[PDB]
Amino acid sequence: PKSYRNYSKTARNPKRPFEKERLDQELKLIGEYGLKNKREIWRVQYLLAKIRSAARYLLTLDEKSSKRIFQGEALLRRMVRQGLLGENEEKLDYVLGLTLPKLLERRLQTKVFKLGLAKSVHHARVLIRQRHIRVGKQMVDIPSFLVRVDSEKHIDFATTSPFGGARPGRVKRKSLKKQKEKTEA
């Protein structure tokens, strides 16, 4: 038989592919938050969009309808966890008011850029891919990673990086050292 390991599309395409304004917006987003394609943006939109849809559905139901209170509450909690809302704006009408910036902010690369670590967004991204960075014990080499506020404070260079204390341990620095040694002897 077929496997049961079901799989799903994470990103819908646009609809109108050469609308100018939209394109420009996308480009701006890419610039600001160091993203590789429009695909990343689309993916994040999709992520946002599902949530938004859920919120809308919840709002269609009245308060103290069981579903609304439970599912809506859960959604709100999730949003809070994600670092989308926080203290002031936790009422389910607010989770609609999320935009793409709010979501992109919580990408790991963005966070890295914010919290010193690298001079740029691009730099941060490359750092992340190059096996530096850790988010509480666990290393992580995907820049997309949506950091939750619980594990925002616990971000730094990993245990095993060259610039997190674990030898120059490179093709470069090590090679240079070797060369120096050779020169000496």
Binding site: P1, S3, Y4, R5, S66, I69, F70, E73, A74
Partner: protein, 257 residues
């Protein structure tokens, strides 16, 4: 050719087994026995997925081979023997005694239990046959025939039944205020008192069962298992005590931990 089906596909397995979609193509297919496959559970599942004494079917089989697991006090070496709703399991080496019960979800837990209480088991009668020599025999949900049952026992009521010896102790009529457990739809774990029975003419006799949060829920009479008189249950119920909370309430409870 076409006759009965020997295999069970792991997705077609009844949910309260809680099998994987991955981790196999097939499921164990309870042997014929004293319980209806959709409301039973084979011994394999118990040994492997519930207690986790075994990692594999093989290990379970090995365990069975040592004549050490008894179900209702007489041994079983059939890995896919169905255990079912009320049955006491006596794993001999640990000196553990389990009794199968339902969770507040559909799921079987093995409850853990004392030597003293282990010696009996509740059994709901279903049919009460007359047989040769005008002797009446009750037939329990345990697919077990109790002969020479006390005349006052009627078609739905439970019976406290001894295990060491086949004879009965006491019986609990299906009354208007009788402590009841459920064993089928939605309200499965639920435990209540009974408010009212409908007693429809041609149809299923629907009954309404008030809980100890005073949340009334209905249910077919079919799938209700008498467990007490209004005061005390005649068995040790699980930790939840058959109090199926609301979803919100459950979530709150989870949070507070």
């Amino acid at each position: 050719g076409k006759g009965i089906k020997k295999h069970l596909k792991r997705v077609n397995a009844p949910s309260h087994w809680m099998l994987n979609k991955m981790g196999g193509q097939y499921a164990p297919k309870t042997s014929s026995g004293p319980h209806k496959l959709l409301e039973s559970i084979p011994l394999v599942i118990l040994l492997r997925n519930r207690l986790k004494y075994a990692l594999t079917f093989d290990e379970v089989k090995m365990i069975l081979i040592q004549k050490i697991v008894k179900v209702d006090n007489k041994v079983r070496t059939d890995c896919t023997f169905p255990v079912g709703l009320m049955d006491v399991i006596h794993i001999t080496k640990s000196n553990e005694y389990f009794r199968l019960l339902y969770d507040i979800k559909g799921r079987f837990v093995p409850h853990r239990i004392t030597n003293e209480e282990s010696k009996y088991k509740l059994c709901k009668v279903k049919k009460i046959l007359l047989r040769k020599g005008r002797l009446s025999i009750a037939v329990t949900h345990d697919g077990r025939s109790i002969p020479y049952i006390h005349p006052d026992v009627k078609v739905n009521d439970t019976v406290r039944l001894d295990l060491e010896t086949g004879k009965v102790l006491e019986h609990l009529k299906f009354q208007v205020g009788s402590l009841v457990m459920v064993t089928a739809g939605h309200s499965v774990g639920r435990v209540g008192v009974i408010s009212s029975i409908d007693k429809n003419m041609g149809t299923y006799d629907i009954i309404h069962v008030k809980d100890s949060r005073n949340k009334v829920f209905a249910t077919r009479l079919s799938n209700v298992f008498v467990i007490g008189d209004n005061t005390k249950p005649y068995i040790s119920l699980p930790r939840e005590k058959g109090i199926k909370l609301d979803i919100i309430e459950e979530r709150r409870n989870r949070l507070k931990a």
